[PDB]
């Protein structure tokens, strides 16, 4: 099951983002697109999609058959479109690309009260997930709030990181 995480990591800018995956490092604060198909060869670390609650997406081929090649082959992809809620609610995903840039996908915000791109439910709030501080280092001082809500019939329990 670990073979299904993309591990194409290349710290070409000596920022040390890969080191946070393997060693305990607190975050420094000196510095502080449609969800279709992403090629796994450009991905480093886990791929999270946020159907209200966060879900981990593993490497598959184009049919959706799970592969175990660490995302190294060109056929390995991430089928983000399959994770969309059937009822048409808010949807988004995020991951780290090979050179340490946080990438996001999602519908364009139809208003200040509408959702964001990745795990941004609110312009001020962020869906909490185990790799939040790795992809979003500046949200460390954000406050957590337990959220219960029904969307399309399904109850979703998750936490939101707000200012």
């Amino acid at each position, epitope marked *: 099951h670990i073979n299904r995480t993309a*591990l194409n990591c*290349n*710290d070409s800018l000596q920022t040390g983002f890969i080191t946070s995956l393997f*060693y305990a490092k607190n975050v420094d604060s000196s510095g502080c697109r449609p969800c279709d198909v992403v090629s796994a060869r450009t991905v480093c670390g886990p791929v999270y999609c946020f159907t209200p609650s966060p879900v981990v997406v593993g490497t598959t081929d184009k049919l959706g058959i799970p592969t175990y090649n660490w995302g190294e082959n060109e056929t390995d992809v991430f089928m983000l479109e399959s994770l969309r809620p059937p009822t048409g609610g808010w949807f988004g995903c995020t991951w780290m690309n090979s050179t340490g840039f946080t990438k996001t996908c999602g519908a364009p915000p139809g208003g200040p009260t509408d959702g964001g791109s990745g795990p941004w439910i609110t312009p001020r709030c962020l869906v909490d997930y185990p790799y939040r501080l790795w992809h979003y280092p500046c949200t460390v001082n954000f406050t957590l709030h337990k959220v219960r809500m029904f969307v399309g019939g399904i109850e979703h329990r998750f936490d939101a990181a707000c200012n």
Partner: antibody, heavy 125, light 108 residues
Framework: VQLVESGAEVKKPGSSVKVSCKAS????????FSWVRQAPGQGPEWMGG????????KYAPRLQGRVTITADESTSTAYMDLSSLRFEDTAVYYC???????????????????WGKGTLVTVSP | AVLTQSPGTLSLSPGERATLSCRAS???????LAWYQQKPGQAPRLLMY???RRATGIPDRFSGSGSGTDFTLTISRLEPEDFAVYYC?????????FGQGTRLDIKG
């Protein structure tokens, strides 16, 4: 983070030897162990590496067939086993904390931050 | 990627400026090159990573630069503790390699 190793050993030509490294100060499962040896009056030579939670172990091509590197998650102790010892294998054997610069297919490569104190292994009759 | 260091032995006086060079048989991707100091009977101490990023605890006098196939370690003013052997190490290719070392000793 500190890395303690097994004591010095003396072996005969053709025998084998097992060096252990205990990592304290960091989680063992995600630790990147690197084994680097250095013959007297020579430069360091990378032997192989192991990341336990990935299960994959990479080896240097020079002695890819004579070394097996294992990690024991129960006791937090990584092991390096070198078999069919030769006189040219007399060296100090270090374990180290590899800090990754790039990763591919279950393994990573980088620089050595925390070095073990060193384990002398002499091959003599 | 084979690393060749120059000079084999570098002889300088305390207070002088030391420049050690590491040359690679092929280009080192993303300047993945580190530098180590080794005093006799000790394990190598990491000085520099990413060609130019100084390791924590390393004094200001240690400086690194270069890219491609030509890397430089610079000690602006030599202190007595700085006479030792220096190794470079590339981590730009899948089997990492070390240089053969440069001995930095006292000029006479």
């Amino acid at each position: 983070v500190q890395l303690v190793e097994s004591g010095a050993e003396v072996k005969k030509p053709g025998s084998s030897v097992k060096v252990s490294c205990k990592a304290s100060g960091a989680t063992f499962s995600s630790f990147i162990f690197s084994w680097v040896r250095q013959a007297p009056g020579q430069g360091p030579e990378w032997m192989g590496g192991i990341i336990p939670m990935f299960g994959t172990a990479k080896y240097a091509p020079r002695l890819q067939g004579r070394v097996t590197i294992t990690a024991d998650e129960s006791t937090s102790t990584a092991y390096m086993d070198l078999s069919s010892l030769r006189f040219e294998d007399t060296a100090v054997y270090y374990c180290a904390m590899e800090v990754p610069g790039f990763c591919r297919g279950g393994s990573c490569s980088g620089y050595m931050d925390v070095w073990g104190k060193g384990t002398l292994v002499t091959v003599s009759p | 990627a084979v690393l060749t260091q120059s000079p084999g032995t570098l002889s300088l006086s305390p207070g002088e400026r030391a420049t050690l060079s590491c040359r690679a048989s092929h280009s080192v991707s993303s300047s993945n090159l580190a530098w180590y100091q080794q005093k006799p009977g000790q394990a190598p101490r990491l000085l520099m990573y990413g060609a130019s990023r100084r390791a924590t605890g390393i004094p200001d006098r240690f400086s690194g630069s270069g890219s491609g196939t030509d890397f430089t370690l610079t000690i602006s003013r030599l202190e007595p503790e700085d006479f030792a052997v220096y190794y470079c190490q590339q981590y730009g290719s899948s089997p990492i390699t070390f240089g053969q070392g440069t001995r930095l000793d006292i000029k006479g």
